[PDB]
Amino acid sequence: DDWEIPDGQITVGQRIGSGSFGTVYKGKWHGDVAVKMLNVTAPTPQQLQAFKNEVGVLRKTRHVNILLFMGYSTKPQLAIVTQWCEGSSLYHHLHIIETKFEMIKLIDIARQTAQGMDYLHAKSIIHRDLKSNNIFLHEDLTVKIGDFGLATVKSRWSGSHQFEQLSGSILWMAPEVIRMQDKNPYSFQSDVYAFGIVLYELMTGQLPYSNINNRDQIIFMVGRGYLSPDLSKVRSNCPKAMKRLMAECLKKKRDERPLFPQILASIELLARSLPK
Amino acid sequence: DDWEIPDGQITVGQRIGSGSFGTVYKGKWHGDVAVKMLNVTAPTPQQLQAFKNEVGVLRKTRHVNILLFMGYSTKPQLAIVTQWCEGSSLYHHLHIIETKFEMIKLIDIARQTAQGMDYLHAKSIIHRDLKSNNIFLHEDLTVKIGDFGLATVKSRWSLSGSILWMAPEVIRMQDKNPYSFQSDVYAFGIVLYELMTGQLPYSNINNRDQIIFMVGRGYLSPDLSKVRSNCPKAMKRLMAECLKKKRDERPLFPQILASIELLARSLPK
Numbered sequence: 001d002d003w004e005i006p007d008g009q010i011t012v013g014q015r016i017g018s019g020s021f022g023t024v025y026k027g028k029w030h031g032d033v034a035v036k037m038l039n040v041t042a043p044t045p046q047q048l049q050a051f052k053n054e055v056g057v058l059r060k061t062r063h064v065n066i067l068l069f070m071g072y073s074t075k076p077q078l079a080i081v082t083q084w085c086e087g088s089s090l091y092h093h094l095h096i097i098e099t100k101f102e103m104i105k106l107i108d109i110a111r112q113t114a115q116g117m118d119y120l121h122a123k124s125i126i127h128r129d130l131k132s133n134n135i136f137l138h139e140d141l142t143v144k145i146g147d148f149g150l151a152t153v154k155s156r157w158s159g160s161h162q163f164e165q166l167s168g169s170i171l172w173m174a175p176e177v178i179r180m181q182d183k184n185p186y187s188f189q190s191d192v193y194a195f196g197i198v199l200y201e202l203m204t205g206q207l208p209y210s211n212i213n214n215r216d217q218i219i220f221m222v223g224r225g226y227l228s229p230d231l232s233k234v235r236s237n238c239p240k241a242m243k244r245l246m247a248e249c250l251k252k253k254r255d256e257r258p259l260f261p262q263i264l265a266s267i268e269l270l271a272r273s274l275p276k
Numbered sequence: 277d278d279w280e281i282p283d284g285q286i287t288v289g290q291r292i293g294s295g296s297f298g299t300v301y302k303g304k305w306h307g308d309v310a311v312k313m314l315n316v317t318a319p320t321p322q323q324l325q326a327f328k329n330e331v332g333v334l335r336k337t338r339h340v341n342i343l344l345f346m347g348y349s350t351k352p353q354l355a356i357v358t359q360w361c362e363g364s365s366l367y368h369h370l371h372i373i374e375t376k377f378e379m380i381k382l383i384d385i386a387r388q389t390a391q392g393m394d395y396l397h398a399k400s401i402i403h404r405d406l407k408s409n410n411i412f413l414h415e416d417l418t419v420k421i422g423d424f425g426l427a428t429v430k431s432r433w434s435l436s437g438s439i440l441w442m443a444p445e446v447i448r449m450q451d452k453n454p455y456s457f458q459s460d461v462y463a464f465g466i467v468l469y470e471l472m473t474g475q476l477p478y479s480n481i482n483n484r485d486q487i488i489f490m491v492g493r494g495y496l497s498p499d500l501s502k503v504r505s506n507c508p509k510a511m512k513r514l515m516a517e518c519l520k521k522k523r524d525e526r527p528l529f530p531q532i533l534a535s536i537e538l539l540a541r542s543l544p545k
C-alpha cells in the first residue's frame with residue numbers, strides 16, 4: 001500500500017532546484033526521478049505527522065496533466081520524489097530561451113493546463129501558486145502541473161520560504177490575495193486569476209508589467225486595482241474568443257471569474273474552430 | 277482518498293479493445309481516458325470484493341513507464357479507466373504496420389520496458405503477461421506497461437494469443453505457480469527478440485500445438501541468428517541470457533536494466 005521510500009534506494013545526482021525551502025535534484029529510482037529534499041535538518045515530531053498529511057494531498061492526484069507523485073522519503077532528509085520530465089518549464093521557454101511557440105500549441109498548452117487544474121479542483125485541491133515556472137512541458141508536448149504540494153507545511157513552519165515564494169510569484173496573485181485581507185484569500189478563483197496570467201504569458205510571451213521597475217508599486221496598484229495586465233498585447237493572431245476569456249479570467253472582482261470547467265469548455269471549443 | 281468513479285461521469289465512446297478479460301473503449305473523463313469494462317453482467321457479491329482488491333494491486337503503481345491507473349468503476353459495469361495514450365502499441369508497430377525503428381530507439385524501447393518491469397517487480401507485482409501488445413508507445417517515444425491488472429480475477433472466474441512469450445516452465449503447466457519474476461524475464465526476452473528482429477519467433481511452424489510441445493520440452497527455442505546485423509553483441513548476448521530454458525540462469529531485472537543502461541552509452545560514436 002504505502003509509498004515511503006527506504007534509505008539509499010534513491011540515488012541523488014545533479015542539482016537544479018536552488019531555493020531555501022527544499023532543494024530539487026535529478027535522481028534515479030527505477031529510472032530517472034526528480035527529488036525535492038526539504039532540508040529541514042531532520043524533525044522534530046510531530047512536524048513529521050504534518051509532512052505525511054501533505055503527501056496525503058499529493059497521492060489524491062492521478063492525472064496525466066498533474067505532475068506524477070512517485071513516493072516520498074523520511075530517511076536521510078524529508079523529501080518527495082516525482083517523475084522526471086525531460087525538457088524545460090513554461091517559464092524557461094517563454095522568458096529564458098524565448099521559444100517561438102506556434103499558436104496552435106499555445107492554445108494547447110493553455111488547455112492542458114486548464115485540463116489539469118480542472119482536475120486539481122474537482123478533487124478539492126487548491127494550487128495556491130500556479131505560474132509558468134510550475135508548468136512543465138514534458139517532451140515538449142505534454143503539460144505537468146507543478147508545485148502545489150505541501151503549503152500546510154509552510155505557513156506553520158519557520159524559514160525565509162513564506163517570504164520567497166510569496167515574492168517570486170506576485171505577478172500571478174489575484175488582487176484579493178495581494179492585499180492580505182484576512183486568513184483565506186486563496187480559492188478556486190485565486191487559482192483562475194493565475195491561470196489568467198499564464199494565459200496572458202502564452203499569448204504575449206512577456207510577463208505582465210515589464211515597464212514598472214519597483215516591485216512594491218506592482219503590489220500596491222494591483223491590489224488596489226489601479227493596475228492590471230495590458231490586454232492590448234495578445235499577439236495579433238490571438239483569437240478574439242481567447243483574449244475575451246483571458247480578460248474574463250482576470251477580473252479584479254473574484255466573483256465575476258469563471259471556474260475551470262467553463263474555462264476548459266470555452267477552450268476546447270475555440271480550438272476546434274481554427275485550422276481552416 | 278478513494279477512486280471509485282460514480283455513474284455517468286465517464287463518457288464511453290469509440291470501441292477498440294477486443295475480447296473477454298475485458299472490452300476497451302476510448303472515453304472521456306477529465307479528458308481522454310481509456311476504459312475497460314469487464315462485461316461480467318453485474319455481480320454477484322462478493323466477486324465484487326475480489327475486483328476491488330485487484331484495483332488495489334493497480335494503485336500500488338505510480339511510475340512513468342507503468343500505464344497510469346486513473347480510477348475504476350462499479351456502477352454501470354465493472355471497469356477500469358486508465359490514461360489514454362495517443363499512438364499505437366509495440367505489437368501493432370512491429371507486426372501490423374511494420375514500422376522501421378532506428379536502432380537507438382529499439383534499445384530505448386527495450387530500456388523503458390525494462391525500466392518499468394524493474395519497477396513492477398520492486399513492488400512485488402508479477403506481470404504474468406508481458407508482450408508487445410501490452411507495451412504501448414505513447415506519443416511514440418514513451419513506453420507504458422500494459423495489461424498486468426487483475427489476474428486473481430480470471431483464474432477464479434468463469435492463455436493462447438500469448439504463448440510466444442511464455443517461458444517453457446510455464447507452457448507445460450507443471451504445477452500451481454509457474455509464474456515468477458523469471459517467467460516475466462523470458463517474456464521480456466521475447467520482446468527483445470521482437471525489437472531486434474522485427475518478427476515473432478517461430479514464423480515458419482504453422483501448427484500452434486508443436487510450438488507449445490517443443491518449447492516446453494526445450495526442443496525448440498528462438499532463432500537468435502536473426503538479430504539484425506547491427507544489433508550490438510552485448511544485447512544479443514543479454515537476450516540469449518534472458519531466454520534460458522532453465523529459469524534459474526535468467527537475470528533479474530535490475531541486472532537486466534544495468535546491462536542495457538551501459539550498452540547504450542557505448543554506441544553513438
Ligand SMILES: CCCS(=O)(=O)Nc1ccc(F)c(C(=O)Nc2cnc3nc[nH]c3c2)c1F
Pocket residue numbers: 016024034035036058066067068069080081082083084085086087136145146147148149150
Ligand atoms: C505533484 C508533485 C508533488 S509537489 O510537491 O506538488 N510537487 C513537486 C514535488 C517534488 C518535486 F521535485 C517537484 C519538481 O519540481 N519536479 C521536477 C520534475 N521534473 C523536472 N525536470 C526538471 N526539473 C524537474 C523538477 C514538484 F513539482
Ligand SMILES: CCCS(=O)(=O)Nc1ccc(F)c(C(=O)Nc2cnc3nc[nH]c3c2)c1F
Pocket residue numbers: 292293298300310311312334343345356358359360361362363422423424425426
Ligand atoms: C486490468 C487492470 C487494468 S491494467 O491492466 O493496469 N491496464 C489496462 C488494462 C486493460 C486495458 F484494456 C488497458 C488499455 O487498453 N489501455 C489503453 C490506454 N490507452 C489506449 N490508447 C489506445 N488504446 C489504449 C488502451 C489498460 F491500460
